[PDB]
Amino acid sequence: LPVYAPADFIPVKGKGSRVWDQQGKEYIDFAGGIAVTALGHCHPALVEALKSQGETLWHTSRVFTNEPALRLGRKLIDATFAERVLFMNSGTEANETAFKLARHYACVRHSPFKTKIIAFHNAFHGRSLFTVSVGGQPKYSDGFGPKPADIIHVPFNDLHAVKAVMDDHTCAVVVEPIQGEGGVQAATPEFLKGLRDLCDEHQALLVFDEVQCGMGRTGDLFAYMHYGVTPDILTSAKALGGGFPVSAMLTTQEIASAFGSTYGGNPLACAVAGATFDIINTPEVLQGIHTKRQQFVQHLQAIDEQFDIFSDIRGMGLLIGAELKPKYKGRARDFLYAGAEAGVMVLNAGADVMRFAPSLVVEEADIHEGMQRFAQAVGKVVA
Amino acid sequence: ADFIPVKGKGSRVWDQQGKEYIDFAGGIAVTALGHCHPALVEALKSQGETLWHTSRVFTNEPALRLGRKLIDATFAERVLFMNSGTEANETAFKLARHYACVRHSPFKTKIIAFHNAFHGRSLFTVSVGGQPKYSDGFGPKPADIIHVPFNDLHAVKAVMDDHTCAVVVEPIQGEGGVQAATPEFLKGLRDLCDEHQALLVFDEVQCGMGRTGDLFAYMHYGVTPDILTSAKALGGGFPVSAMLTTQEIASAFHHGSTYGGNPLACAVAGATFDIINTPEVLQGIHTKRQQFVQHLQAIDEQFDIFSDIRGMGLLIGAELKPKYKGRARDFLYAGAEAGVMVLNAGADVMRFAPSLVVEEADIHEGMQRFAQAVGKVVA
Ligand code: NA
Ligand code: NA
Numbered sequence: 142l143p144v145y146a147p148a149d150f151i152p153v154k155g156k157g158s159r160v161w162d163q164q165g166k167e168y169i170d171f172a173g174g175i176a177v178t179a180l181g182h183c184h185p186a187l188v189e190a191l192k193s194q195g196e197t198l199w200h201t202s203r204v205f206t207n208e209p210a211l212r213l214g215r216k217l218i219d220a221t222f223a224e225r226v227l228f229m230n231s232g233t234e235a236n237e238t239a240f241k242l243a244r245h246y247a248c249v250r251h252s253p254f255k256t257k258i259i260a261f262h263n264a265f266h267g268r269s270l271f272t273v274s275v276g277g278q279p280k281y282s283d284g285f286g287p288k289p290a291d292i293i294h295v296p297f298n299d300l301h302a303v304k305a306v307m308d309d310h311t312c313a314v315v316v317e318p319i320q321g322e323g324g325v326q327a328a329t330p331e332f333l334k335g336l337r338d339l340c341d342e343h344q345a346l347l348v349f350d351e352v353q354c355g356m357g358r359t360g361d362l363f364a365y366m367h368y369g370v371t372p373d374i375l376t377s378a379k380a381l382g383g384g385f386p387v388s389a390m391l392t393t394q395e396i397a398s399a400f401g402s403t404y405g406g407n408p409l410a411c412a413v414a415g416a417t418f419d420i421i422n423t424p425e426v427l428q429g430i431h432t433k434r435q436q437f438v439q440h441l442q443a444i445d446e447q448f449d450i451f452s453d454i455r456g457m458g459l460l461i462g463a464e465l466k467p468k469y470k471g472r473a474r475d476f477l478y479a480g481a482e483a484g485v486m487v488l489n490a491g492a493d494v495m496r497f498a499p500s501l502v503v504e505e506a507d508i509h510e511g512m513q514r515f516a517q518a519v520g521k522v523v524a
Numbered sequence: 525a526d527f528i529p530v531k532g533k534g535s536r537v538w539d540q541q542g543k544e545y546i547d548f549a550g551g552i553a554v555t556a557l558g559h560c561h562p563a564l565v566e567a568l569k570s571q572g573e574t575l576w577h578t579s580r581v582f583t584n585e586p587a588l589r590l591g592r593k594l595i596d597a598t599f600a601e602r603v604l605f606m607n608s609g610t611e612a613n614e615t616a617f618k619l620a621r622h623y624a625c626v627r628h629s630p631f632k633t634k635i636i637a638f639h640n641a642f643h644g645r646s647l648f649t650v651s652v653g654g655q656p657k658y659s660d661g662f663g664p665k666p667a668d669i670i671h672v673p674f675n676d677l678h679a680v681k682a683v684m685d686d687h688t689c690a691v692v693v694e695p696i697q698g699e700g701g702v703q704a705a706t707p708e709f710l711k712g713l714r715d716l717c718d719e720h721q722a723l724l725v726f727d728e729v730q731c732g733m734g735r736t737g738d739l740f741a742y743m744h745y746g747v748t749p750d751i752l753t754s755a756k757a758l759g760g761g762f763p764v765s766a767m768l769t770t771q772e773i774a775s776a777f778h779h780g781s782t783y784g785g786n787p788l789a790c791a792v793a794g795a796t797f798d799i800i801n802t803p804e805v806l807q808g809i810h811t812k813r814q815q816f817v818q819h820l821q822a823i824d825e826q827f828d829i830f831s832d833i834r835g836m837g838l839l840i841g842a843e844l845k846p847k848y849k850g851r852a853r854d855f856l857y858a859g860a861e862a863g864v865m866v867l868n869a870g871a872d873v874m875r876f877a878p879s880l881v882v883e884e885a886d887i888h889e890g891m892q893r894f895a896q897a898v899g900k901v902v903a
Contacts, residue, residue, distance in 0.1 A: 145779055146583070151585065152578050154574055172579070174579040182577075183572070183573060183576065188572055191572050192572065195560070197531050197532075197560070198529060198532050199559065199560065199760075199761035199762060204552075208540075231611065233611065234611070244661070245662055269611070269614045269646050269647075270666055284622050286633035286666070289647055289648075289664055291663055383576075384788070385576065407763055
């Protein structure tokens with residue numbers, strides 16, 4: 142069930158899209174620590190940002206603001222629909238804050254009985270009791286005692302189902318624009334637009350979990366920009382910090398008033414995230430992501446031409462899913478481990494789907510080399 | 525707060541205007557080794573050049589090293605690392621619930637906690653937290669959490685049964701007026717947990733990592749918990765946390781000696797641990813407390829403001845007399861004006877949580893500034 146690295150695979154060093162273990166074995170990284178290291182390992186600009194801020198100031202309590210946090214808040218506010226930004230340490234915490242805010246906004250602006258949260262099967266929002274209960278895998282929320290109530294799950298991309306359970310007692314709809322863990326499934330524009338319209342009709346808040354698909358991952362800064370559907374609340378993490386734990390909850394003044402346009406934020410985390418933002422939010426990187434996706438997809442199609450293993454290639458930008466044909470159902474972990482043995486680090490998205498989330502600046506030579514290693518791994522699994 | 529800190533070094537902090545402050549607050553007991561400690565900066569820089577991040581699929585050398593250090597120095601046999609104390613608390617509470625579920629009964633779900641407790645602001649942790657005002661208004665809270673007064677062993681006895689999975693307690697309630705547990709209370713909780721087969725959970729996010737003069741508060745009391753949480757001081761300002769428990773308990777999870785841990789975080793926390801867990805630092809804490817307390821007594825001798833000085837080691841509470849009840853914020857703001865950063869613990873209590881290696885010169889200067897602030901509020 143879970144993927145655990147063996148005792149002879151402990152990462153010790155990373156540089157760009159390359160990782161070395163304790164035995165000095167080199168790997169090409171198409172996993173990014175699960176879409177976290179969006180600028181690769183020990184990127185010079187991020188290392189510089191960490192070092193200079195690390196000489197100056199690391200920490201301030203929630204009582205104070207700081208220059209890195211204010212700078213990052215301003216950048217996010219300028220680049221998005223947001224008017225207010227709250228910083229935490231992780232996407233889980235950001236989601237906690239978003240869900241709590243949606244609940245509290247409904248409580249004070251409308252009714253204390255307006256508590257229903259609508260989420261989707263296969264969703265992943267974190268492992269805290271609240272976020273795992275909003276998440277759509279019962280296996281992970283069972284066995285921890287009474288779960289926070291008034292959370293309803295319906296299938297992803299099923300607008301009819303949402304209409305059926307949505308009413309004036311609904312406070313929030315929570316959705317990943319692309320379900321990364323749940324098979325790399327993208328929302329249809331109809332579905333997402335419908336959620337926006339239903340939330341408007343019922344005065345509920347539309348919450349986008351973009352912890353995985355955000356911060357350039359899709360080729361747009363956020364996935365909502367691709368769809369042209371504006372959420373009420375957005376959460377971001379993982380890539381935001383490039384490997385440093387940091388997260389952000391984005392919303393409007395009107396919504397945030399329910400609780401300088403910024404709250405919290407570790408000085409060191411925000412300095413690093415600012416450097417990450419400055420690189421990712423450029424025409425060069427964002428437009429390069431589409432080129433790179435095409436390069437990965439070409440290799441995946443070539444492997445499929447040789448070995449015939451995939452039924453679907455999907456996702457957006459450098460979040461790539463490759464669904465295994467029915468003859469290879471449940472074999473995703475085996476392809477992953479074979480990949481590792483061949484010196485390439487990949488992901489799963491359930492037992493039937495291969496997932497790739499490499500650095501957004503991954504070099505062409507690394508794309509080529511890693512995919513040749515993955516091709517070799519595939520051969521060992523099927524032939 | 526009407527100023528923005530831009531730079532810190534040891535126990536001194538500068539704002540945007542270049543005004544210099546003495547830091548007796550430590551970002552709320554987080555910067556246990558002061559700002560930009562050279563050993564912590566060096567660890568950050570060195571690991572920052574090597575590897576920052578691994579997913580939970582992998583371990584890493586800093587995580588393993590930090591795990592070994594915590595395992596060797598405490599009751600723990602297993603360590604799970606997260607980013608924050610709130611997250612570590614989520615993990616501890618979930619583990620206590622799940623252990624009870626799979627080892628005893630799915631109906632064994634009651635968590636006992638205490639009034640004025642703080643355990644974080646996630647829905648679950650704030651519900652276990654003992655401040656109803658902060659858990660109200662977020663929709664249905666997770667159920668089966670009972671609160672009773674801190675230090676009220678009779679009350680614990682009354683609500684505890686075989687359906688109880690956990691007792692969660694801060695050995696010293698930091699936020700709740702800097703109230704220390706009595707030895708009888710903590711031993712009582714241990715005995716009751718043994719009797720009803722519940723897990724004793726120590727939230728040592730604030731009172732842990734050297735704060736009391738021992739590495740963890742449970743060592744002062746000689747009462748061993750089943751699960752302990754640690755953050756704040758653990759990373760000296762870098763966000764990192766740990767949940768410590770035994771192999772028997774940890775086995776309830778669906779993996780070696782450690783789980784998770786950011787390589788950069790764990791490298792910094794390792795350097796922090798190596799410094800704090802020394803006779804020099806730990807013994808130095810008692811001497812520094814005495815100096816702080818003597819200053820507080822001198823201030824009281826002059827101004828007659830305090831009714832009580834409490835806490836342990838370098839977590840210090842000073843309770844205001846009824847004449848000054850509800851005015852802790854006023855002394856806080858006056859302190860800031862006078863150039864000293866302090867804390868509150870409710871509107872009735874002044875709190876201090878300075879660097880564990882705070883220089884004597886800084887103790888005297890900061891306390892003199894606080895005396896000036898006290899003098900201002902009085903006049
Ligand atoms: Na904006
Ligand atoms: Na031990």
